[PDB]
Symmetry: D2
Subunit: 252 residues, 4 copies
């Protein structure tokens, strides 16, 4: 859309997005590709991944995909290595992959707790760990960790997810301190209730909750999040680090 910004510093920039095949992940892939970045992404959904790359084949750089289960850290490290060979040293990382499946407090088991941490928090740390050397060599970079307003609203229904997403604050801040001396910014990008393909299907009370919660009476869309990530990855935000950057219509 011609109304929105063009970021010269993203042209040719190596950008890695996790969980990139669907949802806001796919919006990140599309937006970066349309800015001329050299995008790569990982996901489990190979069919969706191929579709996304195909509809972006007319970008400056067709996005690169590697299938990966991000609960498997060895696999993730291998995928990042394979990606670096194709797009070069990673300059921006969007730690997006998540799973907000509901779970009752009483039903949580040690294994289900661990799985929730694995699919929401743990890979953010290990993906960051794997790109630091690249960013040092580049003279800086930007790591964008996906958070959530879930815990900020004190939502019921998924206590380990709320915990995992609040954890991102600590991850972001700790990494920002250690990586800032190398020009690496680390920020948490916090979506509100994003209307995706998966998310008029609510009941009246759900619509009322969004309208009462948000200050702005409009649907939050993937592109709202993606444009914020563009700015955070671009040179334009070089002194923004350790922030909780909330894009939510004013709810939380």
């Amino acid at each position: 859309d011609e109304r929105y910004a063009r970021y010269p510093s993203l042209a040719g920039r190596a950008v890695l997005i996790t969980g990139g095949a669907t949802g806001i992940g796919a919006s990140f892939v599309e937006h970066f590709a349309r800015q001329g970045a050299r995008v790569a992404f990982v996901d489990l959904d190979e069919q969706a991944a191929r579709a996304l790359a195909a509809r972006l084949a007319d970008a400056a750089h067709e996005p690169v995909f590697v299938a990966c289960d991000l609960t498997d850290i060895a696999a993730l490290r291998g995928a990042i290595e394979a990606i670096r060979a194709r797009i070069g040293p990673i300059a921006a990382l969007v730690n997006n992959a998540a799973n907000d499946v509901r779970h009752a407090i009483a039903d949580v088991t040690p294994d289900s707790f661990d799985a929730c941490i694995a699919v929401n928090l743990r890979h953010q740390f290990f993906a960051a760990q794997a790109v630091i050397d690249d960013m040092k060599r580049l003279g800086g970079g930007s790591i964008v960790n996906l958070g959530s307003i879930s815990w900020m609203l004190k939502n019921a229904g998924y206590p380990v997810y709320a915990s995992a997403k609040a954890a991102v604050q600590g991850l972001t801040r700790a990494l920002a301190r250690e990586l800032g001396p190398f020009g690496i910014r680390v920020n948490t990008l916090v979506p509100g209730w994003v209307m995706t393909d998966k998310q008029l299907w609510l009941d009246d009370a759900g619509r009322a909750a969004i309208k009462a919660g948000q200050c702005i009476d409009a649907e939050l869309l993937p592109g709202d999040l993606a444009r914020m990530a563009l700015f955070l990855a671009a040179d334009d935000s070089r002194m923004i680090t350790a922030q909780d950057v909330v894009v939510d219509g004013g709810w939380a």
Copy 2:
């Protein structure tokens, strides 16, 4: 600088900046003018205002201004009315004017308290009040209120300034709730220690404090803040409202 973003939605957009003639105010005026906006500003200092407009006369629109004292709400309102006559309805307001002069707790008088509130907080409210109808007519807009990390760091030296700048949170949030039904966003933009003053001129302890405080060991510049204001005023940030948008190298 050709590395930074261009925002097509700012071309021709009417933007009003308070305290525009010096400091970060002048950086906001210049950045908006260079994006092609129709900029107006107010400032106490007619000479500084004249100089700023003159050196931006080669922009798409030469910035216009009214010299006045915004502790005088009648004068502020008259200035905004005169500006609206010259640039049309206001689409973005940057509520920037401030005065951080130091004051000891014991030296504060009722008059000096009131003056500090007048020059730091009060005009933000009244400038906003004066542009709401324009933004409602336009179908949206963006109000950017300047905050400060002073109170976040619990700085000594200016307790009424710390109070006035913390107050901006409440102003922002209250306005965001009432104005959001019309597509008007209201955010607080929070600078760190901006080198308008510079690190080199400090003593060893002063330099050390900034280096220890910030995550990134680089000088924060007016342009870091101005680029964030561009994004907040542009269509790109349509669902970002009620935020404390901190640009400070990771200090606060």
Copy 3:
């Protein structure tokens, strides 16, 4: 009530409460009096003040009252002087007086803005200013500034009140830094929606909002706030300073 704490350090302690005649102010007066403190309070409502002192005449110390309009700083300073003569150097100050009268954005005038700041924020600063020397002489003390969840929830209906109450954060933090070297703690005490005599009179939507907002489905009462203030004024909280101490059932 015999179930609640007894604070030995409050016995005989000089405690000043502003706006003490009604509402949570009166609850502070009662609670401190029942702990054996030497209480004084200021208020405009002389009838209510006399009633409150009369029903507490059987405490260790009958509370002392001085009528005062806290928009008049000279009067406030005079009242504090008169109070010090009766209860001794002030060891704890509860900056409680407030007025949350609703006001439309469009209806705010320079005078009404100023009056809202005067009756909500300004006297907190000046009462603090007037007790610092006492607390230095005592070797420490505790200043408790009343805040509000209004601005935290981004409530509509009173933008200058929201601003004034957010300002308390800056006041508290700035004072905490400067006064901490003298053992003076400064904290913001933040009530939720307190059910007072003034506040089953809501409509169904109002009750639903409180039940949806609070985590705990019970009425917040003055005593919930008053017990927190006891702890903050007592020796028990000697290392708690610069906090936003929220007592609200989990809403904000």
Copy 4:
């Protein structure tokens, strides 16, 4: 110390503390025991646990304990069941056990990540899970989760610990929402730099950092935290839930 509060509601109250044998854990055990509570604790170190109970055998109730490894959720659950047999239904839980061992970003492995989450966050969830039914039966209760200012200060040196301690916010808030309908409060208790280590033993720079950070130039002690936990577990704090209750001298 006769200067501090006595909480009548803690007499006979069943209180469970994790990591009870050392550090602030032992201070919690002692303070609750001296208030007349029926204390139980778990700890890895059977010898330290035995010593602690022995030196508190003159309390109204000698503390009881189970030595176990709370990275083993089966063992934790078995311990809590054995404790409930000995002290009755649990009315207050202090989720204290932690390990802040330093770790370089590059040295973190999947195993070491998981172990850090296990010893800092995971057991908080499972201990809470194990006491909910008791608190529902009792008609209320208090769960106090230990946080940290580490991540608030953006400390380097232990990124997974910072992550795990930030996660506690989400755990607290999520549990507070679901448990509040039963009168169960859930709060995060956040210590500063507690002198368990002491200022005198630091180098000049270390002392300076605490003096510059804290508003109050005094050593934070275990008792500062323990008294706050008493208040949070006592009836006195019945409407305080979902909070980050920071006891840190004004640093964070």
